[PDB]
């Protein structure tokens, strides 16, 4: 019996491949070669947010593009005033091993998670005076890899149990559970319309999920190793993934295909962090080579190198207005670039 | 009004920074370890991740044992790269081969090349039985043990047949082949044999951590 299902899967795979090949009207390079390159982009460290004890695994920006939350393995979640290099808050964490941290889009709330398999939401703007934990979310059977707020009283979390989840912070329950991956889901990015979110995993696959109904509408493949970082394009019709095969590649939802390969012969280390710009023209990607590469998303070329970190770059972000780039790295230093 | 909030930010920063200095002192005082395989080791030492604290000679040790996580260790093992050492408890009685290649992967990992490994060789007590009458992996799955003799630099460990000792040092040498190849001052793979009589593994890990910290002190103090 199982042979029949295997043959059915094989013929569906062949049909999908044929449809995708038909969809390949032209490559991105052919219609892109006519645009001017962005040039040798070089931005210096405008501000170094020193103060973390251990490696910075994650960081997130606030909506106002002025405050900044950061997560490090020493167990501290420091909120920074990047304008005046001032530490607004220093939140201790129950679990030191934190791999993700999120800032609520309306402020007032910050979430973090890691190997504890728990997403913890902290209330910043409280009438008591001090930041304390509000709701402790449990239910994921694997390590938390990425958590993102979509709005208040609701959060989307990715885990190492090959599943993504939606939560209601008031009740603390799982509204919708997303399944379908066979590898460790690593990064999730929300669409600007707050209705879909992609998830790259270790099975060399990227899946687009529908938040409300909760099904995997479209799946994407093309990498030969684990996808470590993912980031929606400033418009929610494309996203870019970085993998351990020392390459970065761009996907499109409405094409179900491959767009551009950001790889170079010297580059032999994987990608840890991917973050687009406000215009999407720059695909700033973190690398294990202790530096960040500013890949022009349209023209696949190394148009910038963000050298300055002694150890591996673990996280990367861009302000909402695009006025700054935060680069956390394993050298326990957060650097702002502009 | 701007000046008032400026002083408010300055005083908040002052409080946060003094707290961060105290936390720096606490964090530097503490040493971090990761257990990879046993619950018996955790029990004798003193949720997604289990945290264990213990004290030896007034030095604070933190031990992290991974619990509710999948068998794929290929990325969450990257977190434990700043730890003092990775305690690798091998069953050693196929368990032996899988553990051998786990140790290979840890030793040759890019982020664990600077991370030292402590290797403990569990299940030594029943190793004597399994070599005396088991006729098992050491006899069959590792036929090179027959042509392998006991090295001269062998601890006595009296009260056992020479076959027991030669098999023990045989699989220890199999681990040390991976340990020595691509090996430098970055990490050493200290080999030890488990002792279930007492919990002296705490002292073994303490001495190994002392050696590791002495090595990095030789490094950073420009004494090499």
């Amino acid at each position, epitope marked *: 019996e199982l042979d029949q299902l295997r043959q059915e899967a094989e013929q569906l795979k062949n049909q999908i491949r044929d449809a995708r090949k038909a969809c390949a009207d032209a490559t991105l390079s052919q219609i892109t070669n006519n645009i001017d390159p962005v040039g040798r982009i070089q931005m210096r460290t405008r501000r170094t947010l020193r103060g973390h004890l251990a490696k910075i695994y994650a960081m997130h920006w606030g909506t106002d593009s002025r405050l900044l939350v950061s997560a490090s393995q020493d167990g501290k979640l420091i909120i920074w005033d990047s304008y005046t290099t001032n530490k607004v808050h220093a939140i201790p964490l129950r679990s030191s091993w934190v791999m993700t941290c999120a800032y609520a889009p309306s402020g007032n709330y910050v979430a973090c998670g890691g190997l504890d398999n728990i997403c913890s939401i902290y209330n910043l703007k409280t009438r008591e005076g001090n930041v304390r934990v509000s709701r402790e979310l449990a239910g994921h059977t694997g390590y938390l890899s990425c958590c993102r707020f979509l709005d208040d009283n609701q959060i989307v979390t990715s885990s190492g149990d090959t599943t993504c989840a939606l939560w209601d912070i008031e009740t603390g329950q799982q509204t919708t559970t997303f399944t379908g991956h066979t590898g460790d889901v690593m990064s999730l990015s929300l669409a600007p319309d707050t209705r879909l979110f992609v998830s790259g995993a270790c099975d*060399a696959s990227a899946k687009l999920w529908d938040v409300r109904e909760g099904m995997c509408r479209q799946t994407f493949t093309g990498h030969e190793s684990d996808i470590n970082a993912i980031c929606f394009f400033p418009n929610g019709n494309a996203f870019a993934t970085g993998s*351990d095969d020392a390459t970065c590649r761009l996907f499109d939802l409405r094409a179900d295909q491959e767009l551009m390969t950001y790889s170079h012969d010297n580059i*032999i280390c994987g990608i840890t962090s991917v973050s687009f710009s406000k215009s999407g023209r720059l695909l700033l990607a973190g690398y294990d080579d202790f530096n960040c590469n500013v890949w022009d998303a349209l023209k696949a070329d190394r148009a910038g190198v963000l050298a300055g970190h002694d150890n591996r770059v673990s996280c990367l972000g861009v302000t909402d207005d695009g006025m700054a780039v935060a680069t956390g790295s394993w050298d326990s230093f957060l650097k702002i670039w502009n | 009004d701007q000046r008032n909030e400026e002083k408010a930010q300055r005083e908040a920063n002052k409080k946060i920074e003094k707290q961060l200095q105290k936390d720096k002192q606490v964090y530097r005082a503490t040493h971090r370890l990761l257990l990879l395989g046993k619950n018996t080791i955790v029990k004798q030492m003193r949720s997604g991740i289990f945290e264990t604290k213990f004290q030896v000679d007034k030095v604070n040790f933190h031990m992290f044992d991974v619990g509710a996580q999948r*068998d*794929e*260790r290929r990325k969450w*093992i990257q977190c434990f790269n700043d730890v003092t050492a990775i305690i690798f408890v091998v069953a050693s009685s196929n368990r032996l081969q899988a553990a051998l290649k786990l140790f290979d*992967s840890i030793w040759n*990992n890019k982020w664990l090349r600077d991370t030292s490994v402590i290797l403990f060789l569990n299940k030594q007590d029943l190793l004597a039985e399994k070599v005396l009458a088991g006729k098992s992996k050491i006899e*069959d799955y590792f036929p090179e043990f027959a042509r392998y003799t006991t090295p001269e630099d062998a601890t006595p460990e009296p009260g056992e047949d020479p076959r027991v000792t030669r098999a023990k040092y045989f699989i220890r040498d199999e681990f040390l082949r991976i340990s020595t190849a691509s090996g430098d001052g970055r990490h050493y793979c200290y080999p030890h044999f488990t002792c279930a009589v007492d919990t002296e593994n705490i002292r073994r890990v303490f001495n190994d951590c002392r050696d590791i910290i002495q090595r990095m002190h030789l490094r950073q103090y420009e004494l090499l």
Partner: nanobody
Amino acid sequence: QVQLQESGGGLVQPGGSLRLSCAASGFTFSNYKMNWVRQAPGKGLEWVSDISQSGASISYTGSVKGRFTISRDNAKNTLYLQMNSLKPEDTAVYYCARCPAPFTRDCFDVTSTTYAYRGQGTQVTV
């Protein structure tokens, strides 16, 4: 789209030879330290042998040492694993799993039950 399509061996007499290759169309087949793992029925996945990225650095287990030999073929993108003199420790689904990452000598998790780049199809029923 990593694929590790297998070429089934079939029936082999005790002490015979099979020497069945595999297929690969997703990865480059030159930067991955691929090995061989098999799942005998009623046992967990067990390692067999390894081959380096380009050549040499062969590793075996005793159950296969001196009996079967590997042959990485870059041109055909095939891992041969020439095998002969079969014993009862056989009749498993053979997976020619590859390294999780390229340009490294690290195989952290290949013998797991949920590894992705494994493949299936080589039955070696004795």
